[PDB]
Amino acid sequence: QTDMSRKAFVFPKESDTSYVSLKAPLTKPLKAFTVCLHFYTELSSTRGYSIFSYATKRQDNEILIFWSKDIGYSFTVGGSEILFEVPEVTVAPVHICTSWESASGIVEFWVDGKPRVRKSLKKGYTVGAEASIILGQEQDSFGGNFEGSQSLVGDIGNVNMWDFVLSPDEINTIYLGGPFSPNVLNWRALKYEVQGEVFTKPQLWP
Amino acid sequence: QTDMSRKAFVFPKESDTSYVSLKAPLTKPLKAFTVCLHFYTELSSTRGYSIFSYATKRQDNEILIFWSKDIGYSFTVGGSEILFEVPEVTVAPVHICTSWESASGIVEFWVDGKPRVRKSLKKGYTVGAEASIILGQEQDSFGGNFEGSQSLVGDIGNVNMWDFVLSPDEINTIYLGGPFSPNVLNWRALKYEVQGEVFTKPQLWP
Amino acid sequence: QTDMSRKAFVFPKESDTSYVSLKAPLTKPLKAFTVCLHFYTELSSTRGYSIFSYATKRQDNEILIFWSKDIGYSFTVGGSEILFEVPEVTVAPVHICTSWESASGIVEFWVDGKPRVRKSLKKGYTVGAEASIILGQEQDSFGGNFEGSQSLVGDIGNVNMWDFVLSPDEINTIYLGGPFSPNVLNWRALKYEVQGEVFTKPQLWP
Amino acid sequence: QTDMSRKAFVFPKESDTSYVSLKAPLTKPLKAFTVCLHFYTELSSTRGYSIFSYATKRQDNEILIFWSKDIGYSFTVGGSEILFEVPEVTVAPVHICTSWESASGIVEFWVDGKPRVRKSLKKGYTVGAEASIILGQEQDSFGGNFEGSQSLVGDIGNVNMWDFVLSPDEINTIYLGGPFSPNVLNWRALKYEVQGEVFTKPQLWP
Amino acid sequence: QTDMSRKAFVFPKESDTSYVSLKAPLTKPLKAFTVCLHFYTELSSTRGYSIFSYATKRQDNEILIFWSKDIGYSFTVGGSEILFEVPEVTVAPVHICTSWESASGIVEFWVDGKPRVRKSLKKGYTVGAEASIILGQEQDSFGGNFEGSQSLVGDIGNVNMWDFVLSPDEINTIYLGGPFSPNVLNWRALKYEVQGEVFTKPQLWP
Ligand SMILES: [Ca+2]
Ligand SMILES: [Ca+2]
Ligand SMILES: [Ca+2]
Ligand SMILES: [Ca+2]
Ligand SMILES: [Ca+2]
Ligand SMILES: [Ca+2]
Ligand SMILES: [Ca+2]
Ligand SMILES: [Ca+2]
Ligand SMILES: [Ca+2]
Ligand SMILES: [Ca+2]
């Protein structure tokens, strides 16, 4: 397990082979989660890209956080989708926290510490635990079948995952980088594998 | 009596059956009131919605606080209406306080602690006490006949009602959430009934 | 004499009969003056309106402070006009101080503590003492012949008048509401008569 | 010698006769200078105007600081011109400092404490001591031949002149109005001659 | 060695012959570098210009930092180019730091302390040390063959070079002008030769 603190993964070249795979010590299926990650790319005005792809043997978009050009953030669970329209994107690092609860279907999406309105998605579903988690690519099979036009170019870091919906107060401490304990996927205790042109570098964001 | 402090009602999906009814322990008719409530929705650019709807068996728009698409806030009492035109809408939680006095007919409308110009509506009228208060819908009968195109999608909370016009200073302490005592409808002592797809969740706003 | 501190006159409907008349104990004619007042209205994009009208039996526009739509402020003394162009105007309460000196004819106009450039008007003129001062209407005869399209809708207060040009430092004190001593017309010691639909209410501005 | 501190010259009418002449106790020609001044006018969007005219028997534009409509500031020495483009202009008092060095021909222009890029003008030239310094007008003969379309309307003050290029640090203390010692033309100790409609008034800028 | 602290080179005319050449003690070739500098010019809207130009007898664009009109910054190493698009640009001094590493090919570009996204360029290349470094011009032969349409006009200073990629934290102390030790090219210990119309003056930026 590596402390990746103060570091980011860098995807400096457009490739369909470059990705990192994150491994979860996960067993019980997720009835709810929060995923938070900090990323930086200039593609936002150019094309869509996959921020965070979680896949299962049955479902290649089991969780996907996707920037879709001109639309904004696409958040999709169990192959279903909602949009959080973004009117004008800015060339700066962006922190996102997004969380989903099966009991209510409530999705929260938080961008740079400000909440988007809660939306309903896929009420009562369960996210499978037998998961392939990938950064840098969108996977259309379990751990594979990437597309070059969907790769992330730029940096991703602070990828942390919880099996419960963080409260707004908790999410604020994440955004301020207070101390917190991710119990599904922990940037301070990460397990990962690297393929292709990918690098570990000091994080550009504070 | 429930303390709803730091909690909001969430209407996550458009429907004509999800609503909350609020119960007022009210005997005398109102010669004046202040309604304050804090709400959050992204519908504003898209369609109209009922923020707060007070009805009586003789009048289905006895008090209505309504967002009119492209217009702004519509405030109407006793079936008559005035507009507080809003030039451009931010996508953020908004706190409104509206107050009406029969003796003068003066309407005060306050948005995020800044006053709109005072306007005249229904001088000498009186609002009935035997009333249905509903959040999330506009009611065209004494407690029913909603319309899906008028349902609120998003969050509402801190709904407080007084049987008198708050001074500007008092309204400022509401907006800052200083201590205050609502004597018609109190968020810290609320009595309510939930119907349909409505959830109680931590408030997104501070 | 009434302390009107913290209070404003409210003109909540368009009418040609709602006005207040202010009484000045003047005897000696004015060679110079400053008038300061704080007002709030939403008419500014809609139509022109009289802010402050001082009339004498020979001259209905002996002093007029007038908002001319798309123009901005019209300041007129002795029936003669100068324009302080305002290109776009915020929907907020506005403090104005305007000072005129016969000896030089210099007009200073101050809006929310910022000076406009000094302009010349009616060098050597003198404003008569035996005067009718009216708020909310434009006098086309000595104390009468109002026009509905020229009435103020909204609030006016802190109306203070001096028979001398305040220095810029003094005017900055007025803008901050420090202690000051108006020696022609004093909000803290006002003499007035109310006519028609007009109300006295807590001031909305700080 | 008069202390003009906290005072400005006011040119309230457009005219070709109102000007003030400033007397320099100047006995050695200038190989370099700094001139700094505060002025305030609304002409900027309307027409060109003479901010500071320094003339000699040999040349009527020995130094000229001139606002030229839609262009911005024209700075000219020895009859030759450079422009400092100002794309959009604000209705506020403006402080300028401008300093020229013969040895390098470097012109520094500073507006409200921010430097414009250094530019070259009249390297090796020598500005004459036999000087007519005029405020409010552009003099096209030695102390005369004004043009009404070129007069300043508004205020000018704190005119200070040095026979050397101030460092950026010194310029910053002028902009903040720290204590300083002008050794050519001193507002603390000015010698001046007023002609026509010009007034001395308290300064409007801080 | 000269301490050039608080000082800048000034290029006040467009010319072919105005340049300065900088010398390095360097002998071992650069597998990586950081170059940081302050420059100030008004050309950005008008034409392209060379900010920093490092050449070797094999390659006249061995490192080039170039402003290309409407593009923004062009960063080129070994004759190969990448763009950091700048959407809109304004007349202020600008601090840039640019760092390249052969092992990864990662380019960092920092403008006024904010990072641009890391990009890939000329992975595994090696930059020769037997080098001509020139400010003010772009050299298309080893120390020669400039073009007037590519000269810098305005100021350049604080030119510091390291043979390693500064961390983000180190680059932040450069931007704040903390103490630091450039081990290739040091503004506090500079060796240089001046040709043509060039001057040394107090820096305009803080
Ligand atoms: Ca997929
Ligand atoms: Ca795909
Ligand atoms: Ca109704
Ligand atoms: Ca309805
Ligand atoms: Ca009149
Ligand atoms: Ca009239
Ligand atoms: Ca001339
Ligand atoms: Ca002329
Ligand atoms: Ca070249
Ligand atoms: Ca070239």
Author numbering:
A (entry chain C), B (entry chain B), C (entry chain A), D (entry chain E), E (entry chain D): 1 to 206
What do the study authors state?
C-reactive protein (CRP) is a pentameric protein of 115 kDa composed of five identical non-covalently associated pentraxin domains. The B-face binds to a range of ligands, with the canonical example being phosphocholine (PCh) head groups in lipids such as phosphatidylcholine. This is a calcium-dependent interaction, with each CRP monomer chelating two adjacent Ca2+ ions. The A-face modulates many effector functions of CRP, such as activation of the classical complement pathway, where binding of complement component C1q to CRP is mediated via predominantly electrostatic interactions between the Ca2+-containing globular head domain of C1q (gC1q) and the A-face of CRP.
